[PDB]
């Protein structure tokens, strides 16, 4: 307990640190802004083929075609555009808690309870999707893998670290130790140097993907992060926690901006993504509906009521033309 | 419209096929989750049922095709994955009946069973609970007493009194009684009765369910 | 990937004739297939198609009702049953793959083929049939449509087709802008609905052949005459 002391000391100096820089709140700042409220978005597509829960989806860089993961042990890519099937792929094992589609389109990654991150090829000579390889050195469920190149994938775990893998060797080149509880989602920056992590510690650590090492902690939240989402500037991002509340962290301030909470909602978070201009924050929810936040004034400027089922996953085209989001009813919807 | 789009849905249909005859292949299967704190009997009685991350078993017994998901070499916050189980026909709870007295380890296992039983996701699932080492469990019990594990047990320290008090200990840990049903099994060296009791409570969840699906239940 | 056709030889006129496709090397069940037949010292011209599944069956017009397309997916074979053959079905009957889904490329393997010897449509026009060229420059096969293929989708629905001397034909552009795998950057496409243009940039010996168009918006799929290049 010698050097645990200093810990105490080291904590009360940067709350100091970070509590001089609280000159004025972000919700002062946008007292004059014009507020927004008639979000209104209608149910445009409705993908039907999932016959379990779905737990994860994710958007193609062309924001036309989308992945999803679910318990029937499928993963599927989709054409949103005509609710076309591309691609079916028989999963290995079907307790996938996470998915990715790579940034080329060429691979999908997918992870859960097996504690492996498959690398699925989508172009091959064959006509059929194959498994590039598996990437086994995790030791609790991997619960988000984020690509950031056809060689590289980051992915988060239930073992309370995320790992860089480097896809055609097989080797986890980095690995990120320093969370505390179960890391729960990811969220790669735009120019994919950094990343932040969300764990069942409350916390979001921010990491050098280069170096390995994380520069940043925050710790806001009360309850488990489930969520976590950069914002599309890059030097903010939003996390989703079982505390039924949203939080805007600022990476150069390094503390909380704003918070997204409301008194109706008692259900947590299990998603968070930003509009493609970041003003508005979709947030999944256990209440069966998301919620689009007002970003700079924190207040709902809509909700998205389509699912009779908790709100898993969605997600947001990189052209920002819709809004995805997946729920245990089976069903994925495209908002727009 | 359609000039070639016409054969992509030809795709998005053929496609949609196969996922419905999978999914029709994969719900014609008792899922069943393998629970147990600790050291118990789950290895144990996975050899009995005749197949890092989740061990999936498969057997078939009378017909009927099962798949067992043990998630002890899972080392995180069960908060975080147990809802993934949510539909399981029936939970499979080992107790090993040998570590009333083991390092106090006869009550971490009533924690995980507190923890599942009455957990949101597990309202309805039926809970087979197995008490294995019922011979190690005999044997010990002649020198060790139960009263090191249970200081208000009123009673002799016989095997044959001490098993139901355990088996009753642990079936008034659940406050759901109404919706659903704990089996309860003492088993040692079975010779292939345990697939025989999983049979039958799952025969019974079963038929229960397909009640609730109509409206006699 | 492999396609090998069999099945071919000299037939009386009137006979009849099945050809094989033995397709090795890909998941021939997932892949729609085409028979396309190139008489002798002539074009490309497509004849039979079968969708993945065996839903979808067209015919060209010469060969409907004469001509039956059949496969068999678990031995990974395509059959073409032909009878009432006539003096104008001589040709090399080519085995094509074509697997149709966003962003697929259709027509990418074309098989060997197999030599028979027996004793409205939107008409594809190449505007030239020889082009003198020397390996250093840059040619600009043309291509004409009769109907306009841009669809609504916003796809236009064109493909270029590279068949050497003395080989089969390979995809190099299909949708007219994207190259085909396997294909060097220096093809390249483009157009307006009619009026196509493969541009090759540094033309080696190995781009040395008969070039040909093929539009893929509606059946039956109609080639062009093709364009030739001489070194």
């Known amino acids: 307990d010698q050097l645990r002391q200093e810990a105490e000391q080291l904590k009360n100096q940067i709350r100091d640190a970070r509590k001089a820089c609280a000159d004025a709140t972000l919700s002062q700042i946008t007292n004059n802004i014009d507020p927004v409220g008639r979000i209104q978005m209608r149910t445009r597509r409705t993908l039907r083929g999932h016959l379990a829960k779905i737990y994860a989806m994710h958007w193609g860089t062309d924001s036309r075609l989308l992945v999803s993961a679910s318990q029937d042990g499928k993963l599927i890519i989709w054409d949103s555009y005509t609710t076309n099937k591309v691609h079916a792929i028989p999963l290995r094992s079907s307790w996938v808690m996470t998915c990715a589609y790579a940034p080329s389109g060429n691979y999908v990654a997918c992870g859960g309870l097996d504690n492996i991150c498959s690398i699925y090829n989508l172009k091959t000579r064959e006509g059929n999707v194959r498994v590039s390889r598996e990437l086994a050195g995790h030791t609790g469920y991997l619960s988000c893998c984020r690509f950031l190149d056809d060689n590289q994938i980051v992915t988060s775990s239930g073992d309370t670290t995320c790992a860089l893998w480097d896809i055609e060797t097989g080797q986890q080149t980095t690995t990120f130790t320093g969370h505390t509880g179960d890391v729960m989602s990811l969220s790669l920056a735009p120019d994919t140097r950094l990343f932040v992590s969300g764990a069942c510690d409350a916390s979001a650590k921010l990491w050098d993907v280069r170096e390995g090492m994380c520069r940043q902690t925050f710790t806001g939240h009360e309850s488990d992060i489930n969520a976590i989402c950069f914002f599309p500037n890059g030097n903010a991002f939003a996390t989703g926690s079982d505390d039924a509340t949203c939080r805007l962290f600022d990476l150069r301030a390094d503390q909380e901006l704003m918070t997204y909470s409301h008194d109706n909602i008692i259900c947590g978070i299990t998603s968070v993504s930003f509009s493609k201009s970041g003003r508005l924050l979709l947030a999944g929810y256990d209440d069966f509906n998301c919620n689009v936040w007002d970003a700079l004034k924190a207040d709902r400027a809509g909700v998205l009521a389509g699912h009779d089922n908790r709100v898993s996953c969605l997600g947001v085209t990189d052209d920002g033309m819709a809004v995805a989001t997946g729920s245990w009813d089976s069903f994925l919807k495209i908002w727009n | 419209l359609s000039a070639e789009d016409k054969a992509a849905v030809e795709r998005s249909k053929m496609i949609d096929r196969n996922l419905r005859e999978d999914g029709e292949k994969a719900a014609r299967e008792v899922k069943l989750l393998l629970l147990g704190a600790g050291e118990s009997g789950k290895s144990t009685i996975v050899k009995q049922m005749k197949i890092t991350g989740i061990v999936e078993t498969h057997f078939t017994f009378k017909d009927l095709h099962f798949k067992m998901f043990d998630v002890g070499a899972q080392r995180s916050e069960r908060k975080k994955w147990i809802h993934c189980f949510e539909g399981v026909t029936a939970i499979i709870f080992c107790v090993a009946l040998s570590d009333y007295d083991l390092v106090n380890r006869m009550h971490e296992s009533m924690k995980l069973f507190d923890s599942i039983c009455n957990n949101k996701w597990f309202t309805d699932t039926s809970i087979i609970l197995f008490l294995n080492k019922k011979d190690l469990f005999e044997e010990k019990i002649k020198k060790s007493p139960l009263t090191i594990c249970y200081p208000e047990y009123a009673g002799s320290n016989t095997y044959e009194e001490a098993a139901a008090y355990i088996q009753c200990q642990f079936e008034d840990l659940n406050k759901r009684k109404d919706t659903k049903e704990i089996y309860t099994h003492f088993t040692c060296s079975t010779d292939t009765k345990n697939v025989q009791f999983v049979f039958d409570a799952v025969t019974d969840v079963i038929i229960k369910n397909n009640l609730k699906d109509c409206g006699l239940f | 990937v492999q396609l090998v056709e069999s099945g071919g030889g000299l037939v009386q006129p009137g006979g009849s004739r099945k050809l094989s496709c033995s397709a090795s090397?890909?998941?021939?069940?997932?892949?729609?297939m085409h028979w396309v037949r190139q008489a002798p010292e002539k074009g490309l011209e497509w004849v039979a198609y079968?969708?993945?599944?065996?839903?979808?069956?067209y015919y060209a017009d010469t060969v409907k009702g004469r001509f039956t397309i059949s496969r068999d997916d678990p031995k990974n074979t395509l059959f073409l049953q032909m009878t009432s053959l006539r003096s104008e079905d001589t040709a090399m009957y080519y085995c094509?793959?074509?697997?149709?889904?966003?962003?697929?490329?259709?027509?990418?393997?074309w098989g060997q083929g197999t030599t028979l010897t027996v004793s409205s449509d939107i008409v594809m026009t190449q505007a030239t049939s020889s082009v003198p060229v020397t390996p250093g420059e840059s040619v600009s096969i043309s291509c004409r449509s009769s109907?306009?293929?841009?669809?609504?989708?916003?796809?236009?629905?064109l493909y270029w087709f590279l068949q050497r001397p003395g080989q089969s034909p390979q995809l190099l552009i299909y949708?007219?802008?994207n190259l085909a795998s396997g294909v060097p950057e220096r093809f390249s496409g483009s157009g307006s609905g009619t009026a196509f243009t493969l541009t090759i940039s540094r033309l080696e010996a190995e781009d040395v052949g008969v070039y040909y168009c093929?539009?893929?918006?509606?059946?039956?799929?109609?080639f062009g005459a093709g364009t030739k290049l001489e070194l």
């Open positions: 109907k306009s293929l841009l669809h609504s989708n916003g796809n236009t629905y």
């Open positions: 079968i969708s993945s599944g065996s839903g979808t069956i």
């Open positions: 093929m539009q893929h918006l509606e059946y039956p799929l109609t």
């Open positions: 094509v793959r074509s697997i149709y889904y966003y962003g697929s490329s259709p027509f990418d393997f």
């Open positions: 090397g890909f998941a021939f069940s997932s892949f729609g």
């Open positions: 949708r007219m802008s």
